[PDB]
Symmetry: C2
Subunit: 198 residues, 2 copies
């Protein structure tokens, strides 16, 4: 039970709401993630160098004695995704921005995949493994949706739904709210995919 934990959905939702997404300011949110990531990098560099005064031994043996490296990768994902969503706003009128949109969205999935694999570590708790898999499925669905790959998108969104519903069942109705609203959040996407496979 001294496992690592990362409350991924809680972290991203609370961050997104405070730092710009109340009014679709994805540029503001990306800025925030970037500043957080920089603080995290400096801390990781310090911890990986830190040594005990008496014995001279390293204080922190690897990147997984706390959740900070996991959080650094999550910021990379969130930064790429917010950049993609900014570009989507711009591409509405500037079609030339679509390449850059698609590149950033794929980048977000890639970072989520990296985070998910890190969470497969036996030091990471079971709830976080579910969180990381659900996050990757969400972003995979978003990338597939933007490419109009409707069946692959609905597979990803349905996987996301199934995992969050699993999560919500292991908890009280008060704890489950965030997971349930996340399912509500992707339901318009699931609807749209289903009718394109009609």
């Amino acid at each position: 039970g001294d496992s690592l934990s990362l409350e991924i959905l809680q972290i991203i939702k609370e961050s997104q709401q405070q730092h710009g997404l109340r009014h679709g300011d994805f540029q503001r949110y990306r800025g925030y993630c970037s500043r957080r990531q920089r603080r995290l990098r400096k801390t990781l560099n310090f911890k990986m160098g830190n040594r005990h005064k008496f014995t001279g031994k390293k204080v922190t043996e690897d990147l997984l004695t706390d959740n900070r490296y996991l959080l650094l990768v999550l910021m990379d994902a969130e930064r790429a995704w917010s950049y993609a969503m900014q570009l989507k706003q711009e591409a509405n009128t500037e079609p030339r921005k679509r390449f850059h949109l698609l590149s950033r969205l794929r980048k977000a999935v890639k970072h989520a995949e990296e985070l998910e694999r890190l969470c497969e570590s036996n030091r990471v708790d079971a709830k976080t493994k579910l969180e990381a898999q659900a996050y990757t499925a969400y972003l995979s669905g978003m990338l597939r949706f933007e490419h109009q790959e409707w069946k692959a998108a609905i597979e990803a969104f349905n996987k996301c739904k199934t995992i969050y519903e699993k999560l919500a069942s292991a908890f009280t109705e008060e704890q489950a709210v965030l997971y349930n609203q996340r399912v509500e959040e992707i339901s318009p996407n699931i609807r749209y995919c289903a009718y394109n496979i009609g």
Copy 2:
């Protein structure tokens, strides 16, 4: 469920990265202030919206997460850093004692907050141990030897208990804090006689 605040791990990693260990006391204060400002904004944002319907049954408050506790911890650390700077910049003794007493009062606030049933057992002990350590330091610098040894002994007992309760890995931090105050305890004892 319960709130957790790993007080000793936070203060040691923070003092080490942000200046205090190599005598850049003002840099450490700045870091505490900047962290506080970020915590204040998050807390204001949360509390500012708490009257909105979002599907929850419970209304958020300052003990919904540990951010308010961490805010108070940073006050005690800023006061401690001023005290440490003065200890080095060595009437000025009165200012030293004043800064130490302020750090103690902040720690006492954090300890009272942690009396809440929202806060876990481990965190209550960490808070008690932190207050005891700062109280010991105040009394020690004022040559109140018996009172200093009482506080340091309480501090040592609690950290030994925490060292003895978890992983061999977590024990190292707590054991090192016990090492740190052992010379103070010896000095008190030989003044008492």
